[PDB]
């Protein structure tokens, strides 16, 4: 099967509506204040739950 | 004496595209689609410059009909009476009176009713 008609710019953009990235789970690290991912070791200071690791 | 393409081609196609400004997507972006649409636009425009007169006479007739009914008369009876009474006010003006000058319209309707009675 092949496209019968080429896809227009408007239709193509409509389809890509949901083709987007997202960033979630970021909040300030307790130890150093840098933004980190919740439930992850802070990449900057290497602290999690207030202890170096 | 070689005559290369030059710029006449671009000039002509840009004229068509400017005519097609406002069309949907390719119909305003691409010359071939644009030209095809502009041609249909011409056809529709020529046809509609005739349909336009029909539509407005139709609109005036409907409004005149409503006003005549409010005055106790059908549009057909009103126009027959006006012709008998020699009134040549056309439908455009009659519709204008109906919407705005209801008093003047009532005077015209009374003359039409008088003519019909006679």
């Amino acid at each position: 099967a092949v496209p019968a008609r080429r896809t227009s710019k408007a239709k193509k953009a409509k389809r890509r509506t949901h083709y987007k990235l997202t960033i979630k789970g970021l909040n300030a690290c307790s130890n150093c204040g840098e933004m980190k991912k919740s439930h992850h070791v802070c990449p900057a200071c290497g602290h999690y739950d207030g202890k170096d690791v | 004496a070689r005559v290369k393409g030059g710029t006449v081609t671009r000039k002509r196609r840009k004229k068509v595209l400017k005519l097609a400004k406002g069309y949907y997507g390719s119909k305003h972006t691409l010359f071939k689609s644009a030209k095809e649409q502009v041609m249909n636009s011409y056809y529709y425009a020529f046809r509609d410059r005739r349909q336009k007169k029909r539509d407005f006479r139709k609109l005036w007739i409907a409004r005149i009909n409503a006003a005549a009914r409010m005055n106790g008369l059908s549009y057909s009876k009103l126009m027959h009476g006006l012709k008998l009474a020699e009134i040549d006010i056309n439908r455009k003006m009659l519709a204008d009176l109906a919407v705005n000058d209801a008093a003047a319209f009532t005077a015209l309707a009374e003359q039409a009713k008088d003519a019909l009675s006679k």
Binding site: - | A62, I64, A66, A95, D96, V99
Partner: protein
């Protein structure tokens, strides 16, 4: 000169009429009501704007069906599933849900577009003689001579 009047949305005042359907043939009631809803009865009628008035139809259960329409006029509807054709007689609709009877008849006569659907919403049908729209101060609209 391009001076023809064109009504604006919101400038025309829509009234409220009460139409008693008692023993009025269904179609004729629907026709007069449809003209009112479209606003064809007013000089300010503008085809591309809504200018008609609201209608309250009472005693829908007493609407008149001449001839054998009561049992032989059939309203069909297809569920879009194969063999999904449903039918109900006009008489049965009048007896059980007369509101739908009047509404279907009037829908057929209004335009099949956005403006037409909006104009339909201004219709209110009530089998029986009493309605809840007294707050709108509707006035009776005799149709004995209109039909």
């Amino acid at each position: 000169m391009r001076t023809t009047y064109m009504a604006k949305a919101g400038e025309v005042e829509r009234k409220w009429y009460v139409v008693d359907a008692t023993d009025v043939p269904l179609g004729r009631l629907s026709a007069v009501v449809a003209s009112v809803l479209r606003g064809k009865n007013k000089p300010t009628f503008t085809p591309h704007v809504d200018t008609g008035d609201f209608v309250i139809v009472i005693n829908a259960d007493k609407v008149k069906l001449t001839g054998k329409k009561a049992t032989d006029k059939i309203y069909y509807r297809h569920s879009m599933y194969p063999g999904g054709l449903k039918s109900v007689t006009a008489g049965e609709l009048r007896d059980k849900n007369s509101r739908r009877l009047i509404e279907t008849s009037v829908k057929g006569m209004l335009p099949k577009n956005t403006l037409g659907r909006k104009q339909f919403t201004k219709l209110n049908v009530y089998g029986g003689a009493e309605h809840p729209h007294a707050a709108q101060q509707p006035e009776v609209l005799d149709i004995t001579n209109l039909i």
